[PDB]
């Protein structure tokens, strides 16, 4: 199209300091102990140097595990400790409200050759996020007052639920699902599996510990049945009722 | 299983000496095995109608897979640069899992060649260029050896590019004939497989899977639409974890199958059958009268073969009730073990045509179910009523007969 | 003990079909484990004619490496790779439930596994995801040491024989030397190669000597205490080297190629100097490429002298597991001598056979179904016996394979070459009432110690049948005894004419 | 997937003259979107007569593409890359581009002008052509590539291409057919002003293909092959006006293990019987086929009409086969049908071999499934795979039960309808079929009805498998006999039951058990047990035992009733 855009690519990483496994995380609850890093790969640079931009980007992705997973120790060495947070528990609202900082002041220094301030978030999830309630309220109230369009593009397949989906907890600890009206979700690309079961895709659980432990429940008496004919008639009579 | 690669070679279009094998691992493998790069050279470096496509053909006993790439720019001589990373397999295998890896490798190297000319400048020959305006061999060796040994590779080729390949098996898509009257089992423990990335519906379906809950019951219990439950069950079938089964009643027509001899020829089937079908204690259900210490394997085999095509479970249980009381046998577990091992099956009941005032929607879905010859199970599920009420409603609607198939 | 083994010092070639990409040896010297995508095969070396024990684990991806546990108190532990996880098997359990616990580290395929030679309960696994992890078998939940190169997939991890907390890793063309006390910052990164590093090894007696092979035919020897860069020695061959390991005896090293060469292992004496490869002995054979080589040891129990004899076990792509004896000339050309005094007594291992299947409200005792008829006729036994080549007809196993192949209608009930017991069934025209009809028999055969060497024939015992009379039984036994007595005078093998005669096809004299 | 689906899209006839490769005829001119997801005297005469069979959805306006384009490829490029070199000819040409398998067996001339080793433009093209190729375009799914491509090459492409090579070698046919196709294309595009007046590209292509098929003979063969392999039918192709080739892809509609139709779909009405036709074809590469009876899958006149297309002229095969079809019944063994061979031609006799070949031919080409010789004394149940639900055989608007009931009333209007008939056989316990027949005046017609049911897969046969059991008394008795050569209580509810799985494959003590089981019965029971002990393994049906060993059914009843407490009955199909 022969455009003259001005790109600014920036990573945004959340590290989970706690040692608890990801399977033991309640849905709708944000990570308690977490650290937020930001790494700006390229500043305001026009797309005509795009090859160089992409070169930089590739290097900055291949040297992002060493910069974070290794930590400096005062004893005299490094420690390979630390784990990236998953997308569901990631700091998506913190990314959004970190992006809404270059446009906060209306009387900023003027870009005399560019006009719009479009923002794209590239996520490896499927539009499912766990957020805090107050942060969501503040994020919505801020985004309803500044000139930004946020196009979240997901690199995974479109899920069965509606996107974008935010799961949160109220003050009485009840799960609530909301779809924000300030985010536009795009997906980057018989039968296609739209649900993610990671442990069964990569065979991460072996044969002997994958066996079933809870079988069919034993039959029970109702304390009002006298004969086996009565029990059979009662089971056929209540075979289709839902409690 | 995954087929090992036989020969991997990198082919390039030289503007003077033509298409040729620039590099090849193992060395002198094609000439030793009889493969000649003068018969299929027009498919490896094709005219730009077959380019950017996954050309897979057969040469003798070797299946050859390739993704030829042609780049059009005035920088290269003759306005084109053509290459191909060609993999050779034995014919008698399945080259399905390696095809996306070859396609993605070709696409990645095309992107790199368009970006910074990583493959054109590696030849160290200015004849490839207009002239008016990293080792490939080691990479091929690493790809060949790592894909033969580990089925994975993380081979670095530059400061920011790496050949990153994992080979996944191909799985059959699941059935589409899953309905509301089919109960799901679970051959795997679904509690320990749940992680943070699951679908929200598939989290809720998991607690209500115990071999006795119907899909409509799961949908109403977990507050879910039946369609998404159907899709989630299909996804679980896709990974070979969940297998469907029938709703257990006391009016069913269970019958022996052709695999009842597996209860004798399998050394580990009857021993688990003794422990499975027994109540943990002396249950009270084994003490109710008909009207008012583990079981022997011969007893269980005699009880399996006592079923017949027309003897409902009520009649069989009231015809054999001293045996199921002295031996302390749970009849539902007794039936479910036979259905799980495919030694007995269910003869479905079909109401083919020849009370409280139900509403208009119920009578509409009743007529729609009767017109489609649906079973008693689906009508009972949809109307949320047992078999007797459905039979009375149908007899009020018209004369009909029951087929036990 | 080890000294009554009939397969030590004699060249024997197995045939294990199934595509096995990993082999390991019991330090006791009796069992060999082979890893495939379907699980593990365990093979007794002393009695190769027994079918291998199969432990089931189906994975789509190819297994990388398998390692026996060198802890002498736990000789039933085998560590095998299953893509991203490691399985510690237990041979004392059942064949279908042999998995004890699984190391669930890493995120991608495990590449190599090594045991610490000083602390035999400490493990190191290097994986494709750049991670080298150290595990403890006492608490196998998490790794107690994690390190990475952050650039390239690992290829091997090895421990230092002298320093218990020094381990080397190979990543691409660069080898790092990690120390457990420091962690994540190497002691030294040896950078002198051009192509990728395939194997890494440590000198058994030297403290800081490291050998690496490479794809460009460069075997480089470092003494990293002097200088990290360069190399103490460089040897150039005409082929890429896949596995290069130090000799356990004397001063020398054995290398083998992935492609090229003659698909043979070359043994080179060791008694900045770029030179060419000058092997002493090459293990010629193995028409396809060699997957791995292992060393089988044999020494006295309580002796204080170094009188151990060494054998080589090569597993190759042609589905052949060959045993190479080592002659005394190799013991002389390499600087190996029987030490008069040993500083430390060699470890002693239990010489058990982990091949036979272990024996494993209240149920009532009954016989639900007869074992006969439920049996599977052993047609895999004949195929296994066809693939064993000790040193026309050579031994009892080849004879059993030949009689199995020549007569597909003779069902074998029990085959035991080691105990010389052969129970086989056939249908024969041996009815006094109707000669045309066939009678089912269950003939059992006992062979002596020296079966074809002397005039002693087999002792045939036929189970009683109501269809078989005493006169017919006496006639059959007398004729079989006559055939065995006459046919062992020429020291030939009398099991083809005996079974042919009992089948009634012809008569031999 | 047991559901039949020959994933075919089209055929090309690519010849290689010395002037370059070219495409002579490709039948479906539709685009990728539809496929993946004296002027008219002879033409109208052949169309009304039925010699021009050609589909019409391929020539609709929304489903038409130009003749010069095949699946976004030009004819010149397709003719180029479907024409291999000499080293890649005379063998398989499995070529895949992107979800498109170009499959065929190219036939190339040797070093000499020989095609095989033991108007003047027509002879010029015959002497100038060096290769011809019949290329089928397939789109199988990625999980079923190695099955669909292999069966298509094994059953359709190989035989067709070999017959084409033979007919080209003897009397040049592909040369002549290609020449007349090209001449008719030239006469239609540049002449025959009726073509110009036709409005619409699709109708123009339909007229061109109609004229080509009216003039050519190979074009009709390729069109019929594409149209009938797609329909999963037997394609009979006329070649050289003297030979016929019958091509089919086999349909798996026979099952024994009751496949899980909830997960892996099965053709509705599949014959779920332990007696399978395929076990005789595989043994054609014990049990004799003459013992069984053939059940026709259609009316005999329709079978004769279909058998009139298997031979251009009436040879001896279609005389014997036609006379056998006209005089067959599914209630008599085939051994009794030797006389039909005996009168029509002048143990191990050639009549039995001819009858075996005819039965194999009938049961291979979807005409007559072989079954047990149906009688009124057998037990018949409703198969679980009964064609009840579904609007067609492979649906997965009236269900199959009511359609087949309409056919049943039309064919049998003097007896109760199909729902009543099936409910009388399924609701009660499975007993003999004769308990439904009210009178001997209705015995034959109901037998026909029974055959109809087994023709449609509604009703299968419940066979009996006898297993042998030994209690503790026989064990103590043989222990006492072995002595001739707790203890305080006697619980009568416990028996140490042992099932002899293989009576023939038994040891000495187990044979002692089985022989002590009969110690006390008369001579007839002893002879019947000693002749039928080896068949009590739970896998041999007793009906086949009765047929093979020539024993009475009442004798089997006596043997089963006498040994009541040691014989296990297993009743399944």
From Swiss-Prot, chain A:
This is Vacuolar membrane-associated protein IML1. Component of the SEA complex composed of at least IML1/SEA1, RTC1/SEA2, MTC5/SEA3, NPR2, NPR3, SEA4, SEC13 and SEH1. The chain holds residues 318 to 568 of 1584 of the full protein. Belongs to the IML1 family. Present with 279 molecules/cell in log phase SD medium. Component of the SEA complex which coats the vacuolar membrane and is involved in intracellular trafficking, autophagy, response to nitrogen starvation, and amino acid biogenesis. It is found in: Vacuole membrane.
UniProtKB/Swiss-Prot annotation, chain B:
It is found in: Vacuole membrane. The gene is NPR2. Keywords: Membrane, Phosphoprotein, Protein transport, Transcription, Transcription regulation, Transport, Vacuole. It comes from the Eukaryota. Present with 319 molecules/cell in log phase SD medium. GO terms for biological process: cellular response to amino acid starvation; cellular response to nitrogen starvation; negative regulation of TORC1 signaling; positive regulation of autophagy; proline transport; protein transport; regulation of autophagosome assembly; regulation of TORC1 signaling. Component of the SEA complex composed of at least IML1/SEA1, RTC1/SEA2, MTC5/SEA3, NPR2, NPR3, SEA4, SEC13 and SEH1. Forms a heterodimer with NPR3. Induction: By urea and proline. It is a peripheral membrane protein. GO terms for cellular component: GATOR1 complex; Seh1-associated complex; vacuolar membrane. It comes from Saccharomyces cerevisiae (strain ATCC 204508 / S288c). Disruption phenotype: TORC1 abnormally activated in presence of rapamycin. InterPro entries: NPR2-like. Pfam families: NPR2. This is Nitrogen permease regulator 2. Belongs to the NPR2 family.
UniProtKB/Swiss-Prot annotation, chain C:
It is found in: Vacuole membrane. Keywords: Membrane, Phosphoprotein, Protein transport, Repeat, Transport, Vacuole, WD repeat. Component of the SEA complex composed of at least IML1/SEA1, RTC1/SEA2, MTC5/SEA3, NPR2, NPR3, SEA4, SEC13 and SEH1. Residues 398-509 form the RWD domain. Belongs to the WD repeat WDR59 family. One of its GO terms (molecular function) is signaling adaptor activity. Present with 556 molecules/cell in log phase SD medium. This is Maintenance of telomere capping protein 5. GO terms for cellular component: fungal-type vacuole membrane; Seh1-associated complex; vacuolar membrane. Component of the SEA complex which coats the vacuolar membrane and is involved in intracellular trafficking, autophagy, response to nitrogen starvation, and amino acid biogenesis. May be involved in telomere capping. One of its GO terms (biological process) is cellular response to amino acid starvation. The keyword Cytoplasm does not apply. The keyword Cytoplasm does not apply. It comes from Saccharomyces cerevisiae (strain ATCC 204508 / S288c). WD repeats lie at residues 56-99, 105-145, 149-188, 192-232, 285-334.
Swiss-Prot record, chain D:
GO terms for biological process: cellular response to amino acid starvation; cellular response to nitrogen starvation; meiotic cell cycle; negative regulation of small GTPase mediated signal transduction; negative regulation of TORC1 signaling; positive regulation of autophagy; protein transport; pseudohyphal growth. GO terms for cellular component: GATOR1 complex; Seh1-associated complex; vacuolar membrane. The keyword Protein transport applies. Belongs to the NPR3 family. Its main location: membrane. Component of the SEA complex composed of at least IML1/SEA1, RTC1/SEA2, MTC5/SEA3, NPR2, NPR3, SEA4, SEC13 and SEH1. Forms a heterodimer with NPR2. It comes from the Eukaryota. It is found in: Vacuole membrane. InterPro entries: HTH_NPRL3 (IPR056603), Npr3 (IPR005365). Residues 1-23 form the signal peptide. Keywords: Meiosis, Membrane, Phosphoprotein, Protein transport, Signal, Transport, Vacuole. Component of the SEA complex which coats the vacuolar membrane and is involved in intracellular trafficking, autophagy, response to nitrogen starvation, and amino acid biogenesis. Mediates inactivation of the TORC1 complex in response to amino acid starvation. Required for meiotic nuclear division. This is Nitrogen permease regulator 3. It is a peripheral membrane protein. The keyword Nucleotide-binding does not apply.
